[PDB]
Ligand binder design. Structure first.
Ligand code: MG
Ligand code: MG
Ligand code: MG
Ligand code: MG
Lengths: 570, 570, 570
């Protein structure tokens, strides 16, 4: 006895833990993002039709590409079926059983595990939710319910009915029965036997193929455009009624569940067996900076290495996401994927308000927990060397590798006033008291960090990062949080890997540091391995900036090239 | 007995049918165009001096590079010699025999064939036109005729006379005879014996070489600049008179002909043994679009294939033609040639007025009749794939391969009013009645067409295209003409080969088509093989356009790159 | 007995002739220029610290990288030590012996040769200048002299004293002796024994290493920034006093010299064993033109050849010099070096005023006297071919190879009025009388010249060029000087190697030349090997210029690309 049930996701959303539930990113052919599960857009598929077919694209993809278990099923991502013996849970106005979020109790009480689902499907042909009555909604019957639909047009359903009549004359009585009935299964959520699934699939999609030739939309909006999926809900009933009229059919109606709070529990998988994982975070307004950075990474990439680039994007435009991927198209050793950074607000929480993008670095050990090591780099940078050699630096059981922050070194030396929830104090005292660093001199800059993810997973560093995030607001936000949590667990990278470009004036601050540090800064400027445009004067704005040619070099011959001229003509 | 006579052409112009007449494109080194015959600019040549030497560049090229027949001759492209027995044809005020155009009767009555020319040259040393008298023009003698010339300066002829005297003292009496005579052969049109041709060539060009050192032009205009050719007309007489004074010389004076109506009957020959012939048509204002297209063709070209690109140009600037060829300079497998599209107005005519560029596609089976198959593509496109795979599509005896026009599909479905000489009617009725298409749904788009030229040659499809062009004016011009003539002889290419970019709004028209067609349009947009910027909003104008990066990608790093910025700053 | 003494140079400056004196370009890591000697920036070095360590960078470099002779010494570039027996030369207010310039008498009287220096160091441990008294300057002792220093801060010297005390407790009495003394060796100029040099080096730089950690500058200016070098002058005395207190030490105090007139006598050495030496000259305002030229040279370079490019720069910006070198970074067969052209004013002089850049070509046989042949090219050019084939042209004992000047050919033919110190006369008479050219037609253009340097060295052509430069001012400056001196010693290059772009109007002047010359000009324009943008309308200014695309082609995808748009938007 084998069961495989598929859940349809369109954004980062919690996954069920049972191995028999397979999540699918439906409509992935139209998405530039990853959500942590395979898409419906591999092999023989109709993923691009998801705006119109809805979850039928998952149905189609499983039908054409999956090795079918003895039972094949489909559920929504926040709406599932109750497979447990207790079918007496409190239901509401719509007949659904509500549960706050997807947790271990949710999967236990609703029987969302292999053992409970297997006993529920024992000698049953089809499992599905309870019928819903159209007479309460004011409709006379199921046919009239389609016609009165706010976003429905009966001519589309009439066209589908004629096709069933022509292609399958033996269904005419089943069509009449459903259309004149006052109830039915208004759902695409079911579990049915392998042989019934194949027969229904061949039957349903033969009708839908002809339906595409028989109807034409008339300025349909997003809801009306789902006409195909809406029609398939009626065909589902016509098909079942025909099976019941022919002979036996054992149907088990189950309760429906609803999850009121969306969460995210997934993770990104590596795309190569061995690669240099590079993590960048920016919104649409910094997409130009991210393009130059990614182009700089490609230009200094080792031909014999692979590069797994993941952008934690905050509403980057579809155009910019397309342009960014197009930078990697000619390079099979360079992958670029996008993840909605805003999923981090609902992973383990601080119920105060905070920006997922502002604190994105804190979530690297969780999202990338399947990686051994990962290199984060600020988006306002360009590299002058292979980022892969950062992966070769021996880390031991240190949590991170990073560059010592010489700007903070100046803040401590010159008694710059800090600002946080603990008041206002010199930066040196702030580092010792608030950040609990016995040596404030070990403060590292967060513009480039090699995460020892494997060690963070063993120590559950992520839970500590969240705890520190909850406790108070810090002067330099996640940079302060990571300096506190990673203290005495930091490998120090040479200054060549994080060279400040100096803003408009580089001679005002750095020459007044410790002489040895100033010498290290002067030597690093002469052969940088990464240039950090940290500050107010960005190269995509003024041109009158140190290392400005290094930025232009990587933005020339990209779609952002002509943007820089207008964006610079103040 | 062998005869080879060469005709000098500088633009598309009719060729004589006899195999012994060899057409030459004189001054081809200064031209960017092909006219359908070899140039005077291969091997040892002086083609660039054609503005000054005139037809002497053809003389020089034959002298240095051709295997000389027993008789070598030269004629103009619309002025020839009468080799027939009848030398009594009606002549006019200037002593020329006029004939409307070059046809089969013209070549028959004036003996322009191998048999008649061979009997005319039997025991003759030199054949040439009748002498012309300078006394009727008001001149005292041949010397005075040069001095009184409107665009002549006697100091140039005096310089040439001194050179003949110094280099060839034995010519002094022949110089005096001609200069004091009142008549002579004012022509460069002759047929002479192989040995006389070589001797005259060595003699004439030895003088002209020294003449270049002895004269200097003084702000000469185009007519004055022909001083070398004008002087050679006098030297021709001095040379002949010397031969007659030394001993025997048998001269046969023939009548001159003139062709009052210029036509074109040539064809372009393949430049590779096997290649992908690509035909594009545009004027100078669309040269930027053509550059992006040609660059896109190069960028997606197969290294193991050859590409024979021919641009039917309508007064494209010399600068733009140079820039376009320079796109192919680094690619020995890509050829680019230009042909004046305006020659199509005088090929088989509709004596109404029409634009050669507007109807250029109709003339492809005639100009390219020596090709088996040819791919036409609109100039407002860019390709995303190798155009060579269009040549691999099985055509059978179909006349063309093209993409079904989904815009016309919408016009028929939505009863768009047509406009032609047959009035105003719905597009569906217009397609059935005016275009005689039993199924209006097979209407194909003309933005990319694989011509089965070999089949069109066998069926003489070109004559039918011209007949249909004469009959009436059509709603979509040559697209309608080709849909009518090619009906039921069309292989349908997948929509990926002609993807509309959608202008500024792509959601207004296409979603209201047949649902199956809209799905095909959505799938084709996701991986286009050719992008068609058909419509009002062109990417070289607004930037705010779908597939705009695909156009910029191919115009970047070309001489038109900075043009796009000023042309877009409205 | 072995002696090696090093002199510190920071700009083009005269070198001592004795083989035992080794010149060093100190701080070369911060310079983009060559001055004719090795730098302090190879191997283990601190060259970038030269703004702070001063000549200690030469000391450090010799210590870490040189095979030390029995005696190691250091002198300034215009201040040396008197090694001769006579130590009684007239000294001035500061105790230095002045000499006008570095000549053979200077090296003789002050014993700056191997023989005199060897006898001076016979049984001596350390040689150095006379002590200087701080009491005359108003100081109480050597400690107080540091504190009262205008650009000195005693806290820095106090920090160095504490380090000597901690690291070397045995020096406390030597520290007290020097600090309380009223005199000492305020110098970094010395010669000492090999073993004393190593011990002092390990001692001095161990202190300076710790000093970098113990001090921090406070908005120091250029003079204050030399704190390290200033402190080392005191440590030098502390170290010597300790050696004298421990036991024996034989010290020989020598007189100091000063050279009041700076000269230059060096030469550039080849960087490859075999290469194409290319010499260009421009200031910062023509750096854009030089970038396009150098890029054109790279684009047409033979992969199997090396290219030794030297720019005689006249205050080209640091940014532009960096951008120019960056053009060669991806090309290991192309070297780019810079030399300050202004050193030519002090090589052999005309004590009138003249511009080193205006007459830079005249100095090629002197600066490049170690090359066999050298190709000069104007900066307002782009090449269309490998410059290396100019080196293959047989020169014999001719002094130069160049292109005949057809513009001067027109000036002579049209009696253009010359202008020089000899008055105003037709150009033909000027060429014969002032330039002493029996045939004015052999006048060559100076925009591209192959110098036969080896022949010029044998004939001392440079001395003649200088003599002619002194005598009078010429119409076309160094072009006239070189035409006079190189007359009848010129190999004539084909016109394809120096094609005028024609300014805005090319049809006004050239068609009126000798006809043969005009034909040569028309043929050269059709396939140029070098395009000369000589004149008023430069391609980086107007766009409306012949061969404009040839210039843009080489400036596109460089940092000057966006400069051209603003510089052209008038
Ligand atoms: Mg940053
Ligand atoms: Mg570019
Ligand atoms: Mg078009
Ligand atoms: Mg010049």
């Amino acid at each position: 006895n084998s069961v495989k049930i598929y859940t349809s996701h369109h954004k980062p959303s919690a996954f069920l833990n049972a191995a028999i539930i397979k999540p699918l990113h439906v409509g992935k052919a139209n998405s530039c993002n990853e959500i942590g599960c395979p898409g419906d857009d591999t092999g023989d598929n109709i993923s691009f039709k998801n705006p119109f077919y809805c979850e039928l694209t998952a149905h189609y993809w499983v039908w054409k590409n999956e090795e079918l278990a003895d039972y094949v099923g489909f559920m929504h991502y926040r709406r599932h079926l109750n497979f447990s013996e207790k079918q007496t849970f409190s239901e509401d106005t719509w007949g659904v059983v509500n549960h706050p979020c997807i947790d271990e109790e949710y999967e236990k009480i609703f029987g969302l595990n292999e053992e409970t689902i297997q006993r529920c499907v024992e000698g049953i042909d089809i499992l599905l939710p309870k019928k819903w009555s159209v007479t309460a909604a004011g409709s006379k019957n199921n046919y009239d319910h389609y016609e009165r639909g706010e976003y429905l047009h009966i001519r589309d359903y009439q066209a589908a009915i004629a096709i069933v009549e022509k292609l399958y004359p033996e269904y005419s009585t089943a069509i009449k029965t459903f259309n004149d009935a006052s109830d039915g299964y208004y759902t695409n959520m079911f579990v049915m036997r392998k042989d019934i699934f194949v027969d229904y699939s061949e039957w349903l999609f033969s009708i839908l193929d002809n339906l595409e030739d028989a109807i034409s939309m008339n300025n349909y909006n997003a809801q009306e455009k789902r006409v195909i999926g809406h029609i398939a809900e009626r065909l589902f009933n016509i098909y079942i009624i025909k099976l019941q009229q022919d002979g036996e059919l054992k149907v088990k109606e189950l309760q429906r569940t609803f999850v009121s709070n969306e969460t995210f529990n997934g993770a990104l998988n590596p795309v190569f067996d061995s690669a240099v994982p590079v993590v960048i975070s920016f919104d649409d307004n910094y997409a130009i900076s991210g393009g130059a950075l990614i182009n700089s990474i490609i230009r200094h990439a080792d031909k014999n290495k692979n590069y797994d680039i993941v952008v934690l994007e905050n509403k980057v435009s579809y155009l910019n996401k397309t342009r960014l991927v197009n930078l990697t198209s000619a390079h099979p050793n360079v992958s670029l994927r996008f993840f909605d950074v805003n999923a981090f607000t609902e992973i383990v929480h601080t119920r105060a308000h905070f920006s997922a993008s502002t604190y994105a670095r804190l979530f690297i050990p969780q999202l990338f927990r399947r990686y051994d090591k990962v290199v984060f780099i600020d988006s306002d940078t360009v590299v002058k060397a292979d980022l892969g050699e950062l992966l070769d630096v021996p880390l031991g059981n240190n949590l991170v590798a990073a560059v010592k922050d010489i700007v903070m070194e100046g803040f401590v030396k010159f008694s710059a006033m800090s600002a946080s929830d603990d008041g206002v104090m010199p930066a040196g005292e702030y580092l010792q008291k608030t950040l609990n660093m016995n040596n404030p001199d070990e403060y590292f800059q967060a513009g480039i960090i090699v995460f020892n993810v494997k060690q963070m997973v063993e120590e559950n560093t992520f839970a500590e990062l969240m705890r520190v995030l909850k406790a108070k607001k810090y002067w330099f936000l996640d940079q302060d949080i990571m300096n506190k949590v990673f203290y005495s667990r930091v490998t120090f990278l040479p200054l060549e890997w994080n060279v400040y470009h100096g803003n408009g004036n580089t001679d005002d601050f750095f020459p007044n540091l410790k002489f040895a540090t100033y010498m290290k800064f002067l030597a690093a400027r002469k052969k940088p391995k990464m240039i950090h445009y940290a500050g107010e004067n960005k190269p995509w704005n003024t041109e009158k900036v140190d290392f400005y040619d290094d930025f232009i070099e990587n933005i020339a011959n990209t779609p952002w090239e002509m943007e820089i001229y207008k964006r610079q003509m103040s």
